[PDB]
DNA sequence: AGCCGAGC
DNA sequence: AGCTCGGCT
DNA sequence: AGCCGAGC
DNA sequence: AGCTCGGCT
């Protein structure tokens, strides 16, 4: 037939063409995974084909689009389809290679993503054989322990194994599902007018803020639910369009806007967070290949998606060039994109290194740990819902993304103007506006109207025949405005002719610098419409979409970006009285700890009471006795969800020792001193400290930055 | 010019190209290296071009061997040259694009190599080039601290910084290499006839035996010169070819036996014992990808060859089919290769995973780690000059390798069959001769003359029109026996009709059967001609070149396999002895250290002294006046190659409780009798210890084996 | 001619 | 990638 | 139409 | 690889 990755059933083309299935399978360890599985047997009347990923979208996209996909053609040649054709009479059908289309995903969500825009691909070019239930699936177990096909079936169930993916079942494994097939294979029906209603919604871009009022729903819905203590509610036999899109693809949906939209918290997604989080329990001391950081992320994050796009997440964290990060948390050390190609010059993460920025447990200082909440990944502690940093991250480096229903778009601020705005709050002020700023951007961002900003790089007249371009509009690359703005100008094109002789190329990896030749009278036009029109260095910004997960989870629009500095200013300078609180606690245990430590030893010296040949027993029933507190540090770590004097007798025998009872003693009033001098301090001092410190290793970072 | 590796000479071609220098590189990154390193200016006169690696030796290859070899035919047609052509004349000279060759290589040895095989393309060819000056080479340095060319010189001489090959040189490095020319190029001339008779000696094949005496010489003279204190001689103005060949190239030649021929006392090569070493060191309870192992290896063993040649080391050490490791030090997780293609059906090194064996540390205990010599690579301790196995594992896995002048191949041998060997020598006796046995060949091998053998597959007569093949001889893989003999029978050749009329296969992975079908008068003309000839299931071994580095480092041939087995016998027996001599001082050692903290609490509880408030200097002096020893176990450490009771002082206070001062007085009773117990033992009882806890888990692992 | 394997 | 190097079928 | 990035 | 998803030039 001509496509190499199908493997074709052998009756397909014949007479008995339309009780053949064709099943899509989303990668080709599924496919291989459904070919082991059939067998010999099922080789017959079976074939099967694999998908690379999400398909193309088919209801609003363009004629050449469509007609250059691959994917979308291979399986209108494997099946036989036609466009426009519609298949009722005998006449028609005679044309069809297959009889059906099974698709073969994951059980997770993006499986379900992928049969929605099936179903959205055969619902829009062919009604004819979605109403007659030309589309099955075949659905894989999830979790065993007996088989379960969703996370919440077995929890309110509730020797265990997990199935990531298709590929995690094998051999034997696949053969089983395929021997019985009546609780496997489920038939997408068509009920009427609902399920219109629901693909249409689903996959049409005329029904955006219509999927919003969906998800919000969902939303509200769930967390009511799980307020009241309801069960989550599961699927997994016929399946209705519209049960699927609203049971399943809907929860696709959520945790889309889930991983793609970041908290206004730390200014994080949870793959990000996973990276950080690992950076911060490995503590590398020296640069680690991002491949490997990549596996040990994957390891330690309990993080279940593909290993290229968390590479790339972790390319995007380390960014310093023009235009990305304000500040980066991870080092770039490698070739990890520049100003020129707007990154997608980076080299491959194999031959890449990153660590940690001296700034980044500046930013998220490592006590504030203790007052997060750490969720689990059966059983595996991970990573907080969120961190708290000492300013909000999400304004420094411009948080993005693109969900269903809503996207969010921040462009940069500036660290020190934030850090002066929550001096200004500390101090009882309200804090100045603020445009963004974006790290060694020469040009100006000045303030159109309500969030929309013009954007200007830097252009200059040398001479009647000479300009300078010396600045790109912030996210301009350098060779995109050489191939689409400099080489037309030169070469001219059908409609607009040359405006512009010649042009040099004077650009340093970090710079711009275009010396442009014109004619006197060209330039004299030019500069009378004006540098920065004709030459296109300025360009709109208007954040309109500023979508963020609050501190309960809930998916709040900011209207202005003071909002969200507000909003982030009350929580965070909340969880600075928490840390004073907290610390407190561990510093008094500490110090009680030291005390009894002091009088123990100071005893034993004096001849208070001696260890020596008391049996265990005796000894611990002895020392409750003479008033010793038992381990003050674990007792009151244990307490914010037989007695251990283990700390006392574990001490070495040079405690004895006089140089060691004075450095204990020394110890024991140093740490009382401790308390007392924390304790008279205000949260608002803890914050003026944490800023001090990281504007400090601000400026020696940035300027070591400029003289390198 | 069509070749897309080449940056051309701008005058290459034209009426200078006489003055021009074609610069050939060893690989890549030399090649950019050198490219940055001419410049602007630089690119008239100088062409760069990269070779992969080694290059063809064609002073004894094929005609379609070198007319089908595109590197040869691209550095023809890149310089001009046409075979057969004498250069005197002006008009011949007329024709070439470029009038030099410089070969710019690593200063390693394996650089050395490719200029001798550039010199020895030369001088087959074209003498007319070679006697008059066309050829040079442009030197590096290996290390800095100013410039030395050689690692003699530098040591001679004796921060400090370490080029491993032309990659490690970067930006203005390379740039000052081309500034200063006159230190960097030097010119190879021709003598005389002392030139020619160099080159044949290092790349001709009837040359072999002359090699050999000549590696010889160079051996035994730098072991005396290094007896007598002599210093190494070194190169690096004019180098002659000869001085080139016997001064620099043999070095190469040298290193290719020490790494490619195996020590008879491990039976290891230095990059497998770099390896073995680097597992030890990890201890893995969880296998490791080949990758990161690799990469792992590469920084603990300091292994400065390519990571390729070392994962496949990795691979080579782990495989289990049958054929190829009697016991695998590491194990095969992943597919690392079967039977049916002799291991080339390995998945890449990045998908398999391996940790050492549970034999691995059976057969080189870690005791005797303590026995070892183990090297420095720049003051970082790396392995041992070899490890001392119980049994001589180079008979187990049967070492093999290729050299210069020198070659080793040896068969495998039966584990089982070696252990009662070296019993009978333990219990007085001579040990039995041994055929080559390899783990799970249900195949025989027989002895026929003096170190040579038939080694035959099984088939059987199953009935008048079939024969059965159960089994291939040792190294013959199933495809290619399919491929190559039963095929050719089926189909039948030109010159041969076709045998059999047809074959069925029932492999398994670890097992073969062949089922073919004959007419009845072709079976027994078949057996009467014999079943194993006909159907090529006999193979001849010899084995006349066991060639191993005895534990002084000397380069031995080995007529009989007893002869290593008695060398080993000897060697690893007087280790024993060692190891016992060892052990009583370690064991002695820890039983005084017990001994002294049991006086020093037993007087504590009995109050014969009182440490409390005893200064620390005061009751050093005082611990040292009463008798009390110096941390017996660091002083007799040290011995080998202020007084410290620390071992004694640091104890917790836990120790003068009861039941810690009883199981304080156990343990000295108990060392005390480890050390009566072990000092009654003979080494030959030891050894037959690690024998027996060697075979039990040879026995359980070997079942587990066949089980799964 | 090809295979064996540590190297380029 | 296609090659080295020596022994051997 | 294309860009932005975490996913397939 | 070529695609999703929403906002915006
Ligand atoms: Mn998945
Ligand atoms: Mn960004
Ligand atoms: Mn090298
Ligand atoms: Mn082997």
Known sequence: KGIPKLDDANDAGGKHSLECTLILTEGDSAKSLAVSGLGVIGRDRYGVFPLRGKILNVREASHKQIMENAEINNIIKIVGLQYKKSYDDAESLKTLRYGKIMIMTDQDQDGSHIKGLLINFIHHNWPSLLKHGFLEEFITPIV????????????????????????????????????????HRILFRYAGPEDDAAITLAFSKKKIDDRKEWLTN??????????????????????????????????????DNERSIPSLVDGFKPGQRKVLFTCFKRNDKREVKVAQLAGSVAEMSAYHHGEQALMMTIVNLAQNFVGSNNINLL??????????????????????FTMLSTLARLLFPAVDDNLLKFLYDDNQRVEPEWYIPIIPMVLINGAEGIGTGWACKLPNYDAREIVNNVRRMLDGLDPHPMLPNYKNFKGTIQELGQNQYAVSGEIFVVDRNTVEITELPVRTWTQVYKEQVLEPMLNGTDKTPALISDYKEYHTDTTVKFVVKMTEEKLAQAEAAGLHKVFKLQTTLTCNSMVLFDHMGCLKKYETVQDILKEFFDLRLSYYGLRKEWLVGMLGAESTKLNNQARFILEKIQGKITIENRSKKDLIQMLVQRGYESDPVKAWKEAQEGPDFNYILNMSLWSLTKEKVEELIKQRDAKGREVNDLKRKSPSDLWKEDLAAFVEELDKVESQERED
């Open 144 to 183: 065993k322990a007996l088989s379960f096909y969703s996370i919440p079936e077995f929890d309110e169930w509730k020797k265990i194994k997990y199935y990531k993916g298709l590929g995690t079942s094998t051999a034997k494994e696949a053969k089983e599902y395929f021997a019985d097939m009546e609780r």
């Open 218 to 255: 969902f939303m509200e819905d769930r967390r009511q639910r799980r307020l009241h203590g309801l069960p989550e509610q599961f699927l997994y036999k016929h399946l209705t369009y519209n049960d699927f899109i609203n049971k399943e693809l809907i929860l696709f949906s959520n945790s």
């Open 331 to 352: 080092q770039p050390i490698g070739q990890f994109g520049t100003r020129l190609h707007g990154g997608k010059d980076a080299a491959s993460p194999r031959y890449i």
